[PDB]
Symmetry: D4
Subunit: 222 residues, 8 copies
């Protein structure tokens, strides 16, 4: 049959389904249940959503932070950990890439207004299915295998990765230097973290679809 992909909590399930995987949605559950959750799947897909609980990366909530739901963050961190434990592949999107970062000691900017240098627009008003800002890609990256340098991708976020967690490296950044893609460095599992929303572009962007195909393939290798 098909490799099972656990999607954390529609365009995400269409993406997996189009690429040959069998998607199941993991509801928010208690952290201790993460191990059972990950045993059910071959790969993990972290979805977009709301800002991450600030206490999780040792910060109290700033006036500019949006809504956040602690139970979700706790559960996903446990999923990330259990997934790394089993060496299963991980594809993270938007907040998802920021969650993996918080999970292993990193930090975030709570709001775009807190970046020292003037940032570009990362909350595009342009149709979400289209790219708004240009990214530079590390040539030797996994990203590099699927997207050409200077590709335009969408953006729907007001938070950014501040301190990058140890054991990762930045593979994509916009012209304002903000981190748009992260990959693993000596990690037990294959990992691609993207700041944009490829599940909104794939229906009209072959290259975006390939990121999902990549996850399913890696899940097949297991």
């Amino acid at each position: 049959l098909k490799p099972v992909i656990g999607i954390t909590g529609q365009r995400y399930v269409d993406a997996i389904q189009k690429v040959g995987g069998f998607p199941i949605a993991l509801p928010i559950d208690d952290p201790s249940t993460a191990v059972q959750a990950i045993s059910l799947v071959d790969g993990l897909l972290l979805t977009g959503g709301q800002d991450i609980t600030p206490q999780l990366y040792l910060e109290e909530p700033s006036q500019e932070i949006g809504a956040y739901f602690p139970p979700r963050d706790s559960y996903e961190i446990a999923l990330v950990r259990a997934a790394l434990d089993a060496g299963k592949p991980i594809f993270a999107i938007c907040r998802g890439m920021q969650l993996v970062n918080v999970a292993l000691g990193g930090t975030l900017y709570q709001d775009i207004s807190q970046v020292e240098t003037k940032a570009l627009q990362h909350l595009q008003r342009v149709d979400e299915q289209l790219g708004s800002h240009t990214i530079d890609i590390e040539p030797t990256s996994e990203l590099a295998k699927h997207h050409p340098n200077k590709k335009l991708v969408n953006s729907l976020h007001h938070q950014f990765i501040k301190k990058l967690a140890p054991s990762f490296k930045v593979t994509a950044r916009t012209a304002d230097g903000m981190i748009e893609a992260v990959e693993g460095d000596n990690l037990p599992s294959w990992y691609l973290g993207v700041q944009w929303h490829p599940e909104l572009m794939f229906q009209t962007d072959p290259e975006s679809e390939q990121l999902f195909q990549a996850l399913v393939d890696e899940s097949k290798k297991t």
Copy 2:
């Protein structure tokens, strides 16, 4: 380690299953052919409420008073119901769910309350979703009888009803207007309970309602 309950594509359903000790997994709508793999991933299947069932599935054209439906969901769930019965794994169906099971195995539905021959009671309650609104007579011999006493008060959020009951099923509860509110199997390859109301919206307040979900999970553990 908790038994896996597949929840058909909402939150109050995962809460109920977690409260009772099961590990819920939400099954997205997928191609009917993936139903076997889906069921292979779980020990029990919980069918949730939702839109009216595609009438063509019970060989009827859409009447003017039918609501919205989505063929892809119906197709997939019918497939799930079947892969489940084949596996002998337990099934719990709620509202639309009880109606889908009935359609999956050859029964029919009343497309709207105005089509019942008799003027039925209100089944789309305006009362708080968590509170019961209409009393049900229950067959003392049934599985339901083990969890709810006769004349139990349950909620109601629907405008369609089971018309012709599919073979190998017994009606287990009706409201004063004689409308089918609960259905159990008869000689079926797997344990089954279908209620027309929404226990997932009452279990936080009604321990008896919780027993229904607890029953599903206990049966599911049997594998």
Copy 3:
């Protein structure tokens, strides 16, 4: 010190009682068993408007045209009137309140205007809530007649009506369609006036309406 008037839980009701010299407190819905204590706190009781009365309370299942209802409120207000009657304290009921007193003592009601045998007039007026809309005939020998003249224009914001009158009560007012607009007591331990309209919305501009609250306070003044 002023008499304490317990208002059943709406700002216009507290305005009316304050303007007439009483000290109002709002009683939240609570368990029936606290009704005794609640009443001990007041000198008079005021039943306000709100949702329809749960049908099972007068032995009927919910019909299709019944609006929303909330069992704990009716259950509590029923316990309240019984504790008020038992203590001989005055009771002034408005709209939903008059209907609740009727059901509390064994009465019945029409679940919707559509269900009345003869075609009724408008009772859910569209005219500004403060203005009277339908004319009522008043019984000359009643409590109502002391403050309201026959053929008085009264407002209306309801869709249910009193069906069968409870024992120990007499109908004091009706609209041209024969529908009950006012109910008074007969051989009961308390001073009772139940009006089907909303005087709290008219008093700030209809001195006659204000007198209905003045009555409740004075009657309560008997302590």
Copy 4:
């Protein structure tokens, strides 16, 4: 008979009091002269959240950052706390409540977050009301300490804060912010606890939060 708790004028509040064995009644807004009668009806007093407190009451005109406010309410609650203090009955103030008591006794407020000298933390959380959002430091010796451990996460739905603490009170909790989150009385004629957060929205899911209301009721039946 249960102790009667007068709740100043929502459902969550009555839910909390009932869950703790008290018999609540809501005291609608009335003329200040009736506060005495009002309090003569209860054994305990519970002040609830709501609109900003009228600025003039703490000798200030309205800054263009202030929200709505209804003077008639402030007056009534003021008299209400006075009659409660004089009657020696226990008081529990929530959000707006804690600020009114402060004002009723000479204290002052910040008309808005933007007006605090140093950037404050978020106090009008976007996290659902039932959950705690910011961490608070609690005085180990405080009454609050008896029911809440230090560093407890607490919710926040406010844009004003106490500025100058009315005398005869002591702050018992603050956020990393320095902002005042809890106030207890210093040798007052009655038991008192004012919290800046919303425990009525937390008790259904936070056992410790239920205890604050339990305290009021236990303290209410103590007197009487």
Copy 5:
């Protein structure tokens, strides 16, 4: 010093009168007693659309399908037509207005289109309010005939209708369902025209409709 037209109550009405050369004034709702003082300020009266007429004014309790109504408004408008009549000043009634005049002189109305014994045509058009929706047959010998040809398309935005026509009036136009669309006067102390439709919404793109307002003004500076 153009004709002063009093407009009861409406911006399109003021636009209609202003384009026709009159000086419009808006008469607020006042006590019926002030009606004479009101009409003295004007040379012409224009009754506009609005809510349904209070049912008791024509001896009827409110029907289940009757819409909203405002007694004060009806009371004042009736005293307004009587005063306008005494002074022999011209009156132009629109929609609700034509119906009020009727009720003012002892006529009745259907409380709702569903009450008509024969199935009526649509009179509450979903068509652009500026365009005509139903065709009307006009009395070739009527005032209306001098300004509108027969079978012209006119708009419609009403749910009530004239039932029994008050004496001293005549029907000047009807739709194919027999409903009354225009009322003229017989031996009335003043010029009168009441249409059931909304010409103030059509005159901007319908010359014929502008003519009716022109008639009211011509008739007003024909009494000054």
Copy 6:
């Protein structure tokens, strides 16, 4: 180069034409007299959905259950089909469009589903617009049959129907309730296909639907 398709007026219709190889241009509503100039620059005419056709066009006054209509569009489109017929250019009509053609040539319509003598199936589907809802029987010898199999499920977003079919046309599709879903011409100077449903909302996910627009473009190409 590409065949030009004049689209009467949304986006999905232009998407359909563009996907199929035609160059679409939207023809705004204009004066009937400009109809021949309009058809002169296009190779094919696509009539889109929209409001009900003004009843006056088929000799009926508006029923209470008729919806909104806009005379100028109907007149212009009428002028368009006539000019298109005179040029022998292909015409594809959708929903309202098929009903406008019927009226233009002398047919009639039921103003509302409630007026059909026999209970009709649902034609204003609640299922999302993109999916079929009712099954249609197709005339095996029809043009439609070259693209759709019998019993094909098609969508429905209408409350009006063809009553009396204009002469020189034949019905080629109906739903189990007998209502007309597709009309074709015979001996007409132009290729013509009229469907009651909305193929533009299904073509993105229903190849057969796309064929309908393909046929229009293929045919408009044969005339060059």
Copy 7:
């Protein structure tokens, strides 16, 4: 009979007049040339609140913080005030009104509260519009001081203020802001009181506010 008070338009103002004995008349917007005929129909003129005055009328272009304005209303009301002064008829202006009068005679305004050099107080209250929010200081020898005590609480509903007072006028009231809340005529051909607030929303609950309309009526019959 009863004094005919002309009320300028785009209901509480009507209520105020009627209760005080005047007979209100609504003056729709018309051409400036008709102001003479309009005033000739009344004994008193009441200028009501509304939109900001078009900036050009006081020789300024629209700034980004200015709200909506409708030139026809303004032009007509300016002609209205001129015809009133000519006929010596009394004038009572409210909110926008007091501002129009000041513009019609050469004065200027602050296009927005943000453009004031001194941080002003709140003049667009969130409080029940029927209640007063900010305390005003009243001039002892004021026509206003004859109806309102000093330090009275009054309401607000504006974001624009009078900048430069116009000739023949004296500032009668001010909030601790310094902002002007009332202006009176000085050597003017007619009685004039202009209040920045909305007494028409308080009069039903503040007897003193009722006096202001009483003054206009009395002064009008004379």
Copy 8:
């Protein structure tokens, strides 16, 4: 027959063209390669208001304050103007339309009013859109001068402005702001008038604004 005016995309522009004697047709967004066929169908081109032009087209990345943009529309309209010029067909551009032709030929834009050196006047008026709001200074020798008098009140519904003017153009109108409100061509192959305001919303109640449309169809004739 009448001169055909292709309208890019809006009912008021159609009304404008019809009121003035032209036969309008709406050109929906299509692929750039189809622009030449589009212009071959028309006698004149009318560029309409709409969303901000995408940043990259004038070699810039999106600032936090740009509004929404739709690359396909910009791509097609640019191909459209290029085709119109090759054919020498007249062009009348309105609002974003003026900015699109500017970027089309090398120009630049201010992504938002807050990015201008000085505090600009209000250019997103709250006044009824049919009325003028800010007075513009017009060049006495302007083609624009032939229809509008200097110090003319004109409407405004935009938050972006022309920054660097493209070559072969000249500014013909400015608000007391210094902000460019009208542009005309300098030795361009076709007749051209670019306006920052929305005359199609004023012509109903402003004879001069109608003249701008009449001027387009007369050139297209």
